[PDB]
Amino acid sequence: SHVKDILGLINAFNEVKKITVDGTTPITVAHVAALARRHDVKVALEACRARVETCSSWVQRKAEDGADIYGVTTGFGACSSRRTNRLSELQESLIRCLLAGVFTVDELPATATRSAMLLRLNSFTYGCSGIRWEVMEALEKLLNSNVSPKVPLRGSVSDLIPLAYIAGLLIGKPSVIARIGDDVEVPAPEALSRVGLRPFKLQAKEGLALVNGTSFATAVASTVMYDANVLLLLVETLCGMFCEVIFGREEFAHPLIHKVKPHPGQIESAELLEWLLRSSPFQELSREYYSIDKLKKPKQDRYALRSSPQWLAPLVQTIRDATTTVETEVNSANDNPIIDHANDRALHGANFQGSAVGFYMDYVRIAVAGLGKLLFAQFTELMIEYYSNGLPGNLSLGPDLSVDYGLKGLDIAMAAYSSELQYLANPVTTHVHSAEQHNQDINSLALISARKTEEALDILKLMIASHLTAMCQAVDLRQLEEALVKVVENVVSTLADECGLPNDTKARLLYVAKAVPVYTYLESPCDPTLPLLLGLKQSCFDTILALHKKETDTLVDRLAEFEKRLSDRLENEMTAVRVLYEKKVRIQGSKFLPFYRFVREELDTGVMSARREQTPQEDVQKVFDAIADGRITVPLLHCLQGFLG
Amino acid sequence: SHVKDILGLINAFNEVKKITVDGTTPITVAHVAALARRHDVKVALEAEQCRARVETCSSWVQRKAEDGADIYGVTTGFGACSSRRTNRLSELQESLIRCLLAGVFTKVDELPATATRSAMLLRLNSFTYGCSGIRWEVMEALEKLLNSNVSPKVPLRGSVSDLIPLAYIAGLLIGKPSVIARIGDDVEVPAPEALSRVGLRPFKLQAKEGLALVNGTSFATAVASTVMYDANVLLLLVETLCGMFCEVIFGREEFAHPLIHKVKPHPGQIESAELLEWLLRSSPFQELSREYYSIDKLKKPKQDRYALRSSPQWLAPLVQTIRDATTTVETEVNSANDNPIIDHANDRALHGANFQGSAVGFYMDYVRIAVAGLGKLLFAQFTELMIEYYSNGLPGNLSLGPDLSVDYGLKGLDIAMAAYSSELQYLANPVTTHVHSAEQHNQDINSLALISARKTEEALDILKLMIASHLTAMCQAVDLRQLEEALVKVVENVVSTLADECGLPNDTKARLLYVAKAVPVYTYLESPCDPTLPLLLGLKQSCFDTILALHETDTLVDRLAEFEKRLSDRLENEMTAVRVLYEKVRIQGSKFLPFYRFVREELDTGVMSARREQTPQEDVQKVFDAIADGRITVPLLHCLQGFL
Amino acid sequence: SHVKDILGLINAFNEVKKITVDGTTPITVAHVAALARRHDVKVALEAEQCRARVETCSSWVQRKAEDGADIYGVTTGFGACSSRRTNRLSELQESLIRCLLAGVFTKVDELPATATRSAMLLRLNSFTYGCSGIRWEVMEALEKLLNSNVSPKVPLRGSVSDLIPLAYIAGLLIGKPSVIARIGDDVEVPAPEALSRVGLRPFKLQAKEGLALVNGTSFATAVASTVMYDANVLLLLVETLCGMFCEVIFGREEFAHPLIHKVKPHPGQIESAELLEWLLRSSPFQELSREYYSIDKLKKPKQDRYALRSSPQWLAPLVQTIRDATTTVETEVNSANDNPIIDHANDRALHGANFQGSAVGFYMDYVRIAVAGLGKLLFAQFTELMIEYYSNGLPGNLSLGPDLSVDYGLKGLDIAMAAYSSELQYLANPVTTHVHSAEQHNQDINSLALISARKTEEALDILKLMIASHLTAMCQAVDLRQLEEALVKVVENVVSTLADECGLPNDTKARLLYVAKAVPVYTYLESPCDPTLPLLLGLKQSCFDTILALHKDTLVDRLAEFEKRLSDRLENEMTAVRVLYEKVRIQGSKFLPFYRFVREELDTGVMSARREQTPQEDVQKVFDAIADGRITVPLLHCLQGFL
């Protein structure tokens, strides 16, 4: 299952300490994300060296013999007609011309730049590039010392200009500003000195080798794909939590349904959902709910839950397939020419072309928009009393609803999130211009597309944060609801006794106490125009009619007393249970307990109301930060403990 | 290799006579497309395989409904209305069809018969899994209607994925007077009349039968199936033609070297390069390219432009998208897309959402982007071929001339290629991002698969247009390269012989013959002895050089002036003669000979010029039609025979 | 002319000292942009003009609420909750703010202070119309917060258009501890502390006040105002630089001829052509162009390519879109965007939807499309400029060289221009097509105007990058055209005097002087005496022609001497003039202010391997100048006297 694969990505991200770059060992997207986000993670360039040295001396030797090789003794791009013997000045002229971005401050963040540096280092280990081993060591050192150039955000059609700033750093160009950690910014020469390095003078092919790859697009795509995998599993898992709070029917995930429509992502998401909902205590409440007035209640759930495994199927498959493609690019010699030193040949091709990453970045952005729409639809159902099977509108606790609009702000924001997200998911690759003196008449735009997918994922994180917060609210409302109904039942039953009401009367009134959604009358339980009293008055007329001629005047006396005793005691009992619940059980047997505990206990939150001074912002920000920084994976892995061994 | 998978699809499309429908035998996209396009192809519904399953499920549903079991859409209202129960079993089903006959014929716009018959096939196949509760007899009628070429007229729009369009198939089956049915190509009659013409009687719907007939993804999956078959064929065609482009543009075949792609191993990159290396190995045109770059070596590009050199890298995601989508579409073809799913063995009506065409929907969006990427590659390749700065000797616009002021060659096709690519890029925006909360907010997510499939189909029509033009242009360039080779020899011969006749020194002779070799012939074909055009310019500078190098000089100047006069009355005539001869050979040794032979001989075309009366339209239409009806696959399979 | 209008906007942006907020005086996009960008610009809320009507409306709302009148969001719930009544007037309003403080600070991303302060201005302005029921004191507080540079930190997303983001301004006013306020550039404190520092106390919301504070289009319209100001300025800038493009590319100015555009009278087409006709009328560069096409006339294009020739036709809809959208945004700026509308003069509350930012949302989509169109125009021009086949004499990549093997000129910028245009085109897809049924399906149409304005803002950022690059390339090309002219004269002089020294006839001399004038100098600058390059090719061809012609020994001797003396004198003298140039026709050009601004004020020079400043260093200067408005000085100088 893809579930176990993603769990494997998360463990690797958590547990990796050194990244081995040797030209043989695969770097996964988890390794890239770990390098970028965990500074205790070090790069270990393991000598591979022999290959690199053979390669660079072959290039240098051939260049000096005046051999005809692109970008070595030849001009660049549309300029391969021009030959030259000025080997080092050719290379330097290329870097000078590519330092051409502008700071608008918008920039490629250090995380992406350091990732790009790792990726360039990795490409070099295959021994096709002709770069000196010493330049590779310098990259390892810069990576391990938190040194990276400030890089302008835009300019690549995929990554000459952005990679030129890495080259600029290595050759100590004064105009190239370099970060050292989070605050320090110094010119390249000073940056090199602070970590015990000297500026390089570019040898044959070295300028081109440094700039002629897909490192930036693939770096952004790697962290994009790591996040997409985590958030995907998070979304699939939360569909189960949605089912629990919405009073869904868990049969939507029954294996036979998906066996007969066997998209792998359909089978696997449902298999997960079946396992999460098996023996659910909330599914117990659900079944009990639909057994009461069965023929007045929906036979099927709405699409946002029932159709989730079918919806998720292409999204799972897109995210998993894109991960393979991105990792293939990570572990590739993206460079040109390809030096075949064993067969004494330089091969001319186009491994700098980031089209594999570009196209898959477009697809993933559409899939991410699809995940967002799923969340939007679930969230929407949850806010509307007509679709939430007992829950209050906007998940407002009240009881005074005139001054508690619950999660309405979060609801409005969810539409704003989803709308921008859908917009973002238009393709980037359909916008290819004929570029660079029409030499680059196809170009992938992979970095631009990866940037937009990253932005889409930022929005997805907001939507997940809001959704999980709303569901924790719904858990609290469902647990309070169960407790409130039991209180109403007890008060009604004990008062039926005190007033000496017949058994026919007692059973009719107790049915009303069980059947009526408590949130429809919580605001004012003894309001005669609200559903509890309406139902009781209806049953009281029905009991008078059924017991007539089988003492009417005394019955009415006792029914009037029942109402008056209810008026003096019911509200207080309902208030007391709610005040108790608010001071601080079904979730305890649910597979979603780790999520509820995490949000409530570890993040320090509570059921939302007018009595809780924390704003919706303050609650959701906490959840969002924990999703953004990876802490959310702890309750996730706890939740999935034991799934498929 | 995917190349072998696509060749397998093509062969299956040509060769299938009967499509077996039995609940176990998979239906491929080639099968669906063959049914739609070849009316000799018949459906075989197998009783032994699945009849028992179908009838067991049918009797289960009818019995449980009669005993008043609570099951969605059999004793229950539809969509947002599942709260309402009824025992009016047959009228519940009848009311659903009535409500769904709600499409509109605009202008007319309609789902074509090919799509409608494909959907009938797919709905029939869905029923074979025995989860639907439909009567075997209804399935037999579907088989008979399919084999008799009877299908309803269906409105284009109304589905969010396929209730409204499928209700028209249900309407035909129940003999609704308002539903019009086609019988073959010529007749259309009301549904009651169509049924009796093929010996069928109108069905009265039983429990679940209305819902079973409409609750599928049959139309989206029908359109997607033919979409995916075409995407596979056109992809292989596009890949293959990258080799032909290399041959005529004077590319360096080294771009396809296996080591380059071994170190960047996207499967589509490796596989497309493998194909290209094979196509270009020992090519006679690649020998010409080699000679070309050996003359004035250091003044010509060391590398080709991206439209060729970067083609395997570009093709990689496109290959993989098209192949993965084929798998996904075929999975949908071979699925019980219906609800509820009846588990008769365990006495359970399972409530889910297999009517949701999301797998098809999202993958249609991806394919349309990939098709757009294929179009962009063709556009960039076509553009290079039209511009003399980038075509390495070929005349601008591939204008034969000789008088270029009255021959603008393939300029019309060039402009059209931009128009095609532009619309295609626009079409490739996604449909799946436009989900509306639908049907009383019951359908708060919906696939839009049919709409997306339709747009991908439109994108493939434009791709066909682009392939047709591109192939046409490359045959033009083939004729121009072979004519170039002959013309150069003629000039070399005239210069060599006239150097002797005029008794020129061996220094002069060799220097003049190098000019005849080096100067691109199409730069002076218009007026070969025009003193301002490159041939005479090169001979003039060489004539000053030989005077300076050998400096009796008066006699040398006399011999050079006699050379100029003798050239000025003999050269043009000899060139005209060979050109006329050609208008009445390295392609003979090329893997792309089948394509050239097909376009020139079988389709009866020739080199384009002012002397050929046939218009670009007439030439490209022939090629388009051959792509559209599948005749293009013959030269393609011939071109590829022996590969792997 | 729209050109006068845009100049009026630029002048107003620079000249304004006080923004009068009084319920009658229009606020323009220039005024908003000025408040946002010039901290010395102050708000003046005028009591004399609107205080009276504000207090009448204030008193009306409060008394009706206390009387228990049934008025939306005053004695009723909000949005989908209008069926719920209350008499808890203040708590109703405070529950609305509590509920809308629901944004998240993502990585930090936020609506910037410029946008927030503009939104504060626009909200205050809304209130001056006297339909809102807000207290005068609250308006005074907004004025005071604006002039003291206090503004809340606002999350970027959450509005479908501007409840959530406006709730942070309301949160500041009522002293929410959770709301962080900026004071100037380097101070951030909780709202209660920020109110204290400016002498204000937290407000207690009265009837309707919460809703009044949040129920407008202030954020969408704030970002749209600065978007439109920028769009006007950058539009005029692009239009003007089409004239500079014509000059450097050797264009034919006939494309701007008044009759062409009279017979296809789109106002943007007429007006852009009129500007371009005037910019090029007495151009020294157009004289060079006329001379260029007179040499080998029948071997050179009769027409320019579309990027120049089709520019008025192309600019026409873009001019009109940006102008009309400006009108639309200002109508919104000067509107009572609020609900209910209190009609106190007729004793009634009016229930509508003036909070709907659809006018702005839709026009933001149109403008983003227009801005993409302006980008495509700049890309096409830049592309032509970099390609020798299409530049009419200029070197490829505008590489000075002379050694082209180690000077790739502006190739970096050329690649960047494709990236800029590519992303720009993608951005131009509409936002308004993505309307979700929102807020318990109460907001089943919503404008998404803030989201759209943000995307149009991002498009304009990219357009600024493209303009900076384009102008930098055109300045490069000015230098290259001027050097070209000075180089051709040296070659003509060297050929002429050496033909004299060597005693060559007048037939020979005239032929050789023709070659020197006709051959584009940049095709042989790398090595002028290389026998395989166009100068010596043309001279060798001419020398053979003069030998056959004058035929009836020493002539061959004198020509061999000419060719030898050429390889000794020519390169050194061409080098000399170039070296002098690195250490004129622009002086008569209307685009002198731009060239002077970029070269002198910004301190740049012709780009080459000898100039150590990187393209980044040069273009950043030009971009910074465009971004901060300094570019309008050269723009206004250039346009002086145009009427």
Notable features of this structure?
elongated; L-Aspartase-like (chain B); 645 residues; Fumarase/histidase_N (chain B); 3 chains; three-stranded antiparallel beta sheet; mainly alpha; two-stranded parallel ribbon; 3 domains; Fumarase C, Chain A, domain 2; phenylalanine catabolism (chain B); part of a larger assembly; Fumarase C, Chain B, domain 1
Helix content of chain A: 55-70%
Radius of gyration of chain A: 32 Å
Question: Biggest sheet of chain A, open or closed, and with what strands and sense?
Answer: 3 strands, antiparallel
- What's the structural domain tally of chain A? 3
CATH class of the largest domain in chain A: Mainly Alpha
Count of distinct strands of chain A:
9
User: What is the CATH H-level superfamily of the largest domain in chain A?
Assistant: Fumarase/aspartase (Central domain)
The CATH topology assignment of the largest domain in chain A is Fumarase C, Chain A, domain 2
Q: Per DSSP, what share of the residues of chain A sits in E-state strands of 2 or more residues?
A: under 5%
Compute the separation of the termini of chain A in Å. 12 Å
> What would you call the shape of chain A?
elongated
SS-derived structural category of chain A: mainly alpha
**What oligomeric state is this?**
part of a larger assembly
Placed side by side, the strands forming the largest sheet of chain A appear as 4-6-7
CATH architecture descriptor text of the largest domain in chain A: Up-down Bundle
Biggest interface, which chains?
A: A-C, 92 and 95 residues
Number of helical segments of chain A?
A: 24
EC number (chain A): 5.4.3.10, 4.3.1.24
Keywords (chain A): Alkaloid metabolism, Cytoplasm, Isomerase, Lyase, Phenylalanine catabolism, Phenylpropanoid metabolism, Taxol biosynthesis
Protein name (chain A): Phenylalanine aminomutase (L-beta-phenylalanine forming)
GO biological process, one term (chain A): alkaloid biosynthetic process
